[PDB]
Structure 1
Amino acid sequence: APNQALLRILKETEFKKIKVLGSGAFGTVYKGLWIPEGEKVKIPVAIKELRATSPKANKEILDEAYVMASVDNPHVCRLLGICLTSTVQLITQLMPFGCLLDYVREHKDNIGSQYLLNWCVQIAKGMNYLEDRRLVHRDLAARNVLVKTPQHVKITDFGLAKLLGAEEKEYHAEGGKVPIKWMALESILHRIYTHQSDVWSYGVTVWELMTFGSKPYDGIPASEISSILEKGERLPQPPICTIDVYMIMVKCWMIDADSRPKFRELIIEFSKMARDPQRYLVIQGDERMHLPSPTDSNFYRALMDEEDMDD
């Protein structure tokens, strides 16, 4: 299975940085516009620039560019290209509403059952596509899901994503700092990562959204978590979730990895629930909340722009 994905190299004069969005260990990510020459289009883009220019930091962002260029799905983040300047720049589709964790935290009074179940469906679809590509995410969380519109979310952060060939089932890592509260038990004990460990992290992500962004195992540090899950203890039932949804989470948290649901079945179940949302999620004032949408907005002369329609 040859990977005939196309790596597009961008000129720095083809995109303009508008503002800074966030800086930290990764570098600094900018909100900007990509204007391919002569095409009369603009594309809202996120530009991650990574300064020191350490060789390992380069190697890692180019690995991320590889993985992001090898995926094409409506619920997986779009890689547009990279710029090979003094500091390597990573250009992706701009997600104007940010990460889903911050979104559910700062909009919890306006989020209904329909949006929650639809987010679960879309995330399950993106993960099922990643499983189709035999790709293991290893870092699925509400922080690693970005919001294009309140009606459309996409999986992101492929820094730990690992591809497998046709016959291979597991991934073994070593000495890498890991999000322990989202990991399956077999990944904590033996550093084994499969698509079913991604299902476990999917269950933790669903629990995150149903609790409107509460941190799992809030008071407990990492050390106890392993044995705590060996005792049979799991995350509690969120107050808004019927037993139908909490059962899905619990099945995602089974010790036997083959007993957990598959992402296609999660798509099916959350689809059934999404057609009658308030039968499965009880939210006070659910019945008329409004979440925003684009109003042809932002700062200047945006008469010729789009993003998921540039092919």
Structure 2
Amino acid sequence: APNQALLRILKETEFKKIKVLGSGAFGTVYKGLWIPEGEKVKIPVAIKENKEILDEAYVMASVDNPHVCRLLGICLTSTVQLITQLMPFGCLLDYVREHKDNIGSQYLLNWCVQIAKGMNYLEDRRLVHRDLAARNVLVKTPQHVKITDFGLAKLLEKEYHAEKVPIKWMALESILHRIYTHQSDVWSYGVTVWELMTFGSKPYDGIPASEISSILEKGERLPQPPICTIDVYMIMVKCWMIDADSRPKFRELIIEFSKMARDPQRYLVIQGDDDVVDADEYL
């Protein structure tokens, strides 16, 4: 299947950087505005500022789904820059932490559906993410999230065999054999749902990563979050089945959470309950 995606090259003059959003091992992500040349539009963007950034560019350019991050372009300056759609509410892990008290069952179950859709689309592009986690989901709006961080992503050959790596989100086989598949991604989807259902708890809080492999071998798993009916917890547990072919398919995860999302309070129990254009409109 020849990959005929287009990689757009951007001139630096086409965009203003307005303020820093975060820094470190990553470089520094600014937020800004992209004004395409002779276009009377203005697109809000994240601008992340060598081989590693290009591999990510490659993967990101080759994807196109409403629940997976839009790569707008790259700029080839002294320092390379990835330009992507600005996701104004930030990473979902922090979002659930900083709004624990005003998140409803509807949002939770929808996020679950959307993350599955993003992942199923990646399964469709023979693409394995290898780093799904609440931290790597961005929030465009509370109604709409997208999967991100393709720094570990790999194209496909029914598995991938690697040479730190984020241990507590990892499938057993991956910990022990560095084998990664779409079913490895499902295990990670499991933990991601757990993060969301506990409003951003750290999994195996205060437990060394070394001892993780053995813990899972023995049979232990993440506890049932208080808001979760057994119906929902059962889905998490199925995602953590030692035998990868026993775990659900993203496809089926979309369906189960969809069903739950039509009667959210049965499945989750929570006391309470000018020339600007967004990138999704810029084709």
In the TM superposition, residue 219 of structure 1 has moved relative to its aligned partner by 1.5
Post-superposition Cα deviations, 1:207-238, rounded to whole Å, max 9, x if no partner, equal 00000000000011101100000001000000
In the TM superposition, residue 2 of structure 1 has moved relative to its aligned partner by 0.2
What is the percentage of aligned positions where both structures have the same residue? 99
Q: Is the 8 A contact 2:85 2:279 kept in 1?
A: no
Among candidates 194, 204, 208, match of residue 195 of structure 2? 208
Q: Residue 129 of structure 1 aligns to a residue in which SS?
A: helix
TM-score of the superposed pair, with normalisation by structure 1: 0.89
Distance 1:309 1:28, change over 3 A: closer
Aligned partners of 2:276, 2:208: CA distance in 1, in Å?
Answer: 44
Aligned partners of 1:213, 1:269: CA distance in 2, in Å?
Answer: 22
Aligned partners of 2:81, 2:147: CA distance in 1, in Å?
Answer: 20
Aligned partners of 2:250, 2:278: CA distance in 1, in Å?
Answer: 24
Q: Is the 8 A contact 1:99 1:142 kept in 2?
A: yes
Aligned partners of 2:250, 2:238: CA distance in 1, in Å?
Answer: 12
Post-superposition Cα deviations, 1:163-186, rounded to whole Å, max 9, x if no partner, equal 00xxx1100001xx1110000000
Post-superposition Cα deviations, 1:41-94, rounded to whole Å, max 9, x if no partner, equal 000000001xxxxxxxx0000000000000000000000000001100110000
Post-superposition Cα deviations, 1:94-121, rounded to whole Å, max 9, x if no partner, equal 0000000000000010000000000000
In the TM superposition, residue 38 of structure 1 has moved relative to its aligned partner by 1.0
Q: Is the 8 A contact 2:105 2:269 kept in 1?
A: yes
Q: Is the 8 A contact 1:93 1:307 kept in 2?
A: no
Q: Is the 8 A contact 2:44 2:278 kept in 1?
A: no
Aligned partners of 2:172, 2:277: CA distance in 1, in Å?
Answer: 39
Q: Residue 306 of structure 1 aligns to a residue in which SS?
A: coil
Aligned partners of 1:105, 1:15: CA distance in 2, in Å?
Answer: 32
Aligned partners of 1:196, 1:246: CA distance in 2, in Å?
Answer: 18
Aligned partners of 2:176, 2:276: CA distance in 1, in Å?
Answer: 45
Q: Residue 310 of structure 1 aligns to a residue in which SS?
A: helix
Q: Residue 47 of structure 2 aligns to a residue in which SS?
A: strand
Q: Residue 123 of structure 1 aligns to a residue in which SS?
A: helix
In the TM superposition, residue 310 of structure 1 has moved relative to its aligned partner by 5.7
In the TM superposition, residue 308 of structure 1 has moved relative to its aligned partner by 5.0
Post-superposition Cα deviations, 1:131-155, rounded to whole Å, max 9, x if no partner, equal 0000000000000000000000000
Aligned partners of 1:308, 1:264: CA distance in 2, in Å?
Answer: 29
Q: Residue 6 of structure 1 aligns to a residue in which SS?
A: coil
Q: Is the 8 A contact 1:124 1:267 kept in 2?
A: yes
Aligned partners of 1:309, 1:216: CA distance in 2, in Å?
Answer: 34
Among candidates 148, 155, 158, match of residue 169 of structure 1? 158
In the TM superposition, residue 307 of structure 1 has moved relative to its aligned partner by 4.9
Q: Residue 66 of structure 1 aligns to a residue in which SS?
A: helix
Post-superposition Cα deviations, 1:258-306, rounded to whole Å, max 9, x if no partner, equal 0000000000000000000000000011xxxxxxxxxxxxxxxxxxx45
In the TM superposition, residue 125 of structure 1 has moved relative to its aligned partner by 0.2
Among candidates 94, 98, 121, match of residue 86 of structure 2? 94
Aligned partners of 1:89, 1:240: CA distance in 2, in Å?
Answer: 41
Ranges of 4+ aligned residues in structure 1 off by more than 6 Å = none
Aligned partners of 1:40, 1:172: CA distance in 2, in Å?
Answer: 47
| Unaligned 5+ runs, structure 2 | none
Distance 1:207 1:139, change over 3 A: same
CA RMSD of aligned residues (A): 0.9
Among candidates 265, 271, 279, match of residue 309 of structure 1? 279
Among candidates 97, 100, 107, match of residue 105 of structure 1? 97
Q: Is the 8 A contact 2:41 2:277 kept in 1?
A: no
Q: Is the 8 A contact 2:43 2:279 kept in 1?
A: no
**Does the alignment pair 1:36 with 2:40?**
no
Q: Is the 8 A contact 2:47 2:84 kept in 1?
A: yes
Distance 1:307 1:268, change over 3 A: farther
Q: Is the 8 A contact 2:7 2:61 kept in 1?
A: yes
- Count, aligned residues: 279
